[PDB]
Symmetry: D2
Subunit: 249 residues, 4 copies
Amino acid sequence: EAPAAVVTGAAKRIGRAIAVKLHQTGYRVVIHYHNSAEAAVSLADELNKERSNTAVVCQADLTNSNVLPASCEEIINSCFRAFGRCDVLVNNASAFYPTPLVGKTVETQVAELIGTNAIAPFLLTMSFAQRQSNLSIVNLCDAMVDQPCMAFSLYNMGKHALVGLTQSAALELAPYGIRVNGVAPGVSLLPVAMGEEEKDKWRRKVPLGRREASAEQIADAVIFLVSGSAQYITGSIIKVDGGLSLVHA
Amino acid sequence: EAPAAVVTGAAKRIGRAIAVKLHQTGYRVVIHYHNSAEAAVSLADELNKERSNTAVVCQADLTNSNVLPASCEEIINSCFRAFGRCDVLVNNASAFYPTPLVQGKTVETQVAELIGTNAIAPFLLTMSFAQRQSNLSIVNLCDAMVDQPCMAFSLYNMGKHALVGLTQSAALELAPYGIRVNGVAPGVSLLPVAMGEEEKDKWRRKVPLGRREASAEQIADAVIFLVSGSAQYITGSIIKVDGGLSLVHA
Amino acid sequence: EAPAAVVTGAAKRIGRAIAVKLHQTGYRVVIHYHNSAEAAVSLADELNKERSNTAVVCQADLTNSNVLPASCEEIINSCFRAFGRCDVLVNNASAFYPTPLVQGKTVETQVAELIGTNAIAPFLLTMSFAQRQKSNLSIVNLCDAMVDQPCMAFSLYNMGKHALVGLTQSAALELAPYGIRVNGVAPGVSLLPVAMGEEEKDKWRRKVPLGRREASAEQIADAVIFLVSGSAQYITGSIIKVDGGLSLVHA
Amino acid sequence: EAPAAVVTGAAKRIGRAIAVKLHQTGYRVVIHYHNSAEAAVSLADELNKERSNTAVVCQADLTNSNVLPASCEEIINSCFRAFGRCDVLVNNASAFYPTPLVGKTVETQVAELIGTNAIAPFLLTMSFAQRQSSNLSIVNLCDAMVDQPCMAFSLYNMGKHALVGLTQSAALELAPYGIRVNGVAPGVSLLPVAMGEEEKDKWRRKVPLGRREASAEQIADAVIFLVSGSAQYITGSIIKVDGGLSLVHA
Ligand SMILES: NC(=O)C1=CN([C@@H]2O[C@H](COP(=O)(O)OP(=O)(O)OC[C@H]3O[C@@H](n4cnc5c(N)ncnc54)[C@H](OP(=O)(O)O)[C@@H]3O)[C@@H](O)[C@H]2O)C=CC1
Ligand SMILES: NC(=O)C1=CN([C@@H]2O[C@H](COP(=O)(O)OP(=O)(O)OC[C@H]3O[C@@H](n4cnc5c(N)ncnc54)[C@H](OP(=O)(O)O)[C@@H]3O)[C@@H](O)[C@H]2O)C=CC1
Ligand SMILES: NC(=O)C1=CN([C@@H]2O[C@H](COP(=O)(O)OP(=O)(O)OC[C@H]3O[C@@H](n4cnc5c(N)ncnc54)[C@H](OP(=O)(O)O)[C@@H]3O)[C@@H](O)[C@H]2O)C=CC1
Ligand SMILES: NC(=O)C1=CN([C@@H]2O[C@H](COP(=O)(O)OP(=O)(O)OC[C@H]3O[C@@H](n4cnc5c(N)ncnc54)[C@H](OP(=O)(O)O)[C@@H]3O)[C@@H](O)[C@H]2O)C=CC1
Ligand SMILES: Nc1nc2ccc(C(=O)NCCc3ccc(Cl)cc3)cc2s1
Ligand SMILES: Nc1nc2ccc(C(=O)NCCc3ccc(Cl)cc3)cc2s1
Ligand SMILES: Nc1nc2ccc(C(=O)NCCc3ccc(Cl)cc3)cc2s1
Ligand SMILES: [Cl-]
């Protein structure tokens, strides 16, 4: 049988490119989404048109709450009910917006930024391992976590927490033969609505080609980590950032 | 006028050593506690006997919830109410226990306590501290071993990693206000109460420098340095106080 | 035509595994060696019998000296002489032995070999590779996943490997405008020392979380192959640990 | 009597501040110099005038050569000769200039940038340890911007990374002998003399904490901490003193 993968936030952008590349590689895929139902379905139909019964969707909010654990359990369950197995988990979904220290409430900001970026990955990891051959987890990290954007403390805290989870889970799941790694983009798909003049400011900062990563470039690193070529690699985070993190102020 | 400091979890162990040593340096202190009522009030009496009117207690649960922000605001407010100022915040309080990935508390409670005390409360206290705002600074108690974690401590480790991120992000953001933000990262220090002595020595034997744990006073010493005039250009730094433990391979 | 790669210390162990895998991916290869003449020529012979005129050898001491620059220059020239191009440089050659701080070789000689092979020669080879550029160019440095938790009494080796991290970052930054990527691969425990006894080997094996075994040479080569491939076209200044989780294990 | 310290490149700038501060703390000191004999003696004069026979000078080139070992033995020797003991080694001396990948020969650049910055610390460390209750420690002057290097400064960067490696390996290896080994990592301090005045402001404005460079004395403060009894459990730690500069993205 073909292996199966869960990709969170898979409807658009980087998660979309990861789901596609996984599918092309021979995986059956669960496309998780929160709001982008139409995008998620059309991806699934396209993939199912390539190969019948190889893609399903799964809706869930990943914000931190007393139901998040149940939600994460269900995401993993959906892979097993659809495909009879779950070989790969890709923690891709992410909230990202500034939270200055000095119109959502603070507790909502915490729930959203820490929930999506750290806690949901942790709950998904627990459910993935408990329901368990090349098993692996890939967490989407951030190459700029030690040189953060001003006034993004909660986001940055969530991405640091994810690094800790990657390391902690790699150590703890290694006896079960589940590898746990990360991919850390620098600047990738810029917001659609961000002005070209602003996009160019970011672009210019990147040493390797003065451009942002495509979603496919990020996906390429994910494909490597889940592949047979990375069978000894666990607890590693590969930056895919064109040297951006090497550039001083 | 004497400056004032908030120390979280200051009733016992390292937080107490920190509050004691700030006091001895000239600070008025808010001793925050959750459960350790007796010990809290006892320390404040000791300090107040030494110099009257220089110590208060403040009770608060630092578990994440929709009212954690109000509790954090309150801890800071208590310092202004007692002393008219708040110059130093020490984020010391911490929950610490295993949370295995593969199987009495629900997971949602484990998340609330470990991520709340170790990371979210620090963030909220930082926000409140900065909003109410001389040599201002915050010191976060981090963990020297965060990249070589204890097995089955994923949520604790995640909390401490988040605290590093907070240390860096708040140092950057609060620098224009003249608030410095730094960390102190113990290795093995005061060893948990429910621990055997064969097991204590096991851990002691791993430490290159003197084959022993840090005293609480040794941790406090680094806190004292970071808040002092000798650290005025230091921000976003984490000082490991680990006796070389983090350098030892498996 | 087929791209060409230089692999340093490629006669045996991990360098051979890298040269072989680059060859199987369709590269022409320079097999650099120092003392291992028989093993180097034998590997080129194997590779040549597989596709002719696709492998040469190149002898050079990579100890630091006033002639180390010329020697590194000549290694790169060997690739242009044999193949007309040089697309990939793998800095694999490495000296490895204790240098205790509280104490056959003089200390001068220790510094020359451990800092020379592990750091200075990579720098000089990087310079020569970049200067000779007259496509998908990259350099891969063989680093060490355990550089922040070092073996007792290996200060000079550790200093060299840390310098190599510094090179990887500095060269990635400086060479990116020229389209040359520079990355590292950091093994934990892989092929154990020839001179090591089995009992000692198993002590090391038992520390690895993922499988309680060392990395195969092939598993190291796999990451090298990833970094030079078009699947890594936006990756520069990254060091990929291939350590089975060993660097995560506390004392 | 009183403890003794060796500070390398202590004639000027950061090394002088370190020497002066150690002296004020009550150390007797060896002021190492290569070129700056006048400055070295002038500083010795100022310190002996303060406390009689508490400062001596020592000449040595710290370029890498067949004689560096002998030179490093001498520096440590002169401390034992003058003062009968050697409690502290500060590896401060350092060369700094670009070495583009695409004047001096390369091997001179290597000898200076790797030699002075990394090899001489390693040899001084050996001699210091060989010639050994006490509070013995070594402090290495590192660089906070090591992971975000200046364009075309590869050899310099290699040397400072090697210095981190030495700090770690020596902390591990000497911990059994009660010798601590730590680092202090400045960001932008006293800028190069030849550097334009407009170019200097460019850098000052990047620093989060106060849009200014560290004074030499601020660097020295961190050294003082690390050698003090307040850091007796600290080894293998590197303290950044950079005013947050290393946290700022491109
Ligand atoms: N793009 C870049 O330059 C960089 C990206 N990264 C990391 O890469 C990963 C992918 O990046 P990118 O594609 O740009 O991400 P986006 O910001 O586009 O978000 C991806 C998806 O996350 C989902 N998501 C957001 N909030 C929630 C929530 N509360 N519950 C559930 N799902 C939620 C959304 O699903 P839906 O649309 O269905 O609601 C969204 O489509 C992320 O983890 C990100 O942090 C890191 C560095 C830079
Ligand atoms: N001890 C060591 O070896 C090491 C410690 N550290 C770090 O150093 C710091 C101090 O260590 P240590 O003294 O051992 O800490 P403790 O484990 O003794 O805990 C400190 C205090 O935190 C408080 N706390 C726990 N949960 C809560 C909560 N929900 N709400 C409010 N307060 C709470 C408790 O207050 P109360 O008693 O009033 O209930 C407790 O006494 C911690 O942040 C720790 O992570 C780092 C690594 C090594
Ligand atoms: N093996 C492991 O477990 C680990 C390996 N690594 C790194 O991976 C890489 C490959 O490891 P491995 O295959 O074990 O390496 P080896 O120790 O087997 O050395 C590889 C080659 O280095 C060459 N070499 C040594 N000294 C010199 C010199 N003075 N001049 C020129 N060449 C020299 C030798 O060539 P010749 O035989 O022709 O003389 C030798 O075959 C190295 O960079 C190493 O540090 C990192 C951590 C763990
Ligand atoms: N300046 C800054 O802002 C920064 C400082 N640093 C580090 O801080 C430390 C002190 O910096 P700073 O005061 O600017 O250093 P300098 O560049 O001014 O050099 C300090 C001293 O080193 C000595 N020295 C240089 N080359 C040699 C050599 N070949 N042999 C012997 N001695 C030599 C000189 O002594 P003499 O005059 O007697 O010839 C010189 O005065 C260094 O380790 C540096 O790398 C790192 C980051 C930035
Ligand atoms: N889920 C997401 N996580 C991240 C993390 C980083 C970035 C990113 O780098 N975006 C472009 C750079 C940037 C930085 C700051 C702002 Cl205000 C806008 C854009 C974008 C995203 S989207
Ligand atoms: N609030 C606290 N945070 C920490 C962090 C680390 C340690 C520690 O390292 N303790 C000694 C090692 C250890 C680990 C787990 C247990 Cl159950 C006992 C001892 C102890 C504590 S207490
Ligand atoms: N050129 C080489 N560089 C390295 C770097 C590290 C290792 C390694 O970690 N080997 C296994 C551990 C080990 C410990 C002590 C010794 Cl005497 C040998 C091997 C082995 C090698 S071989
Ligand atoms: Cl030369």
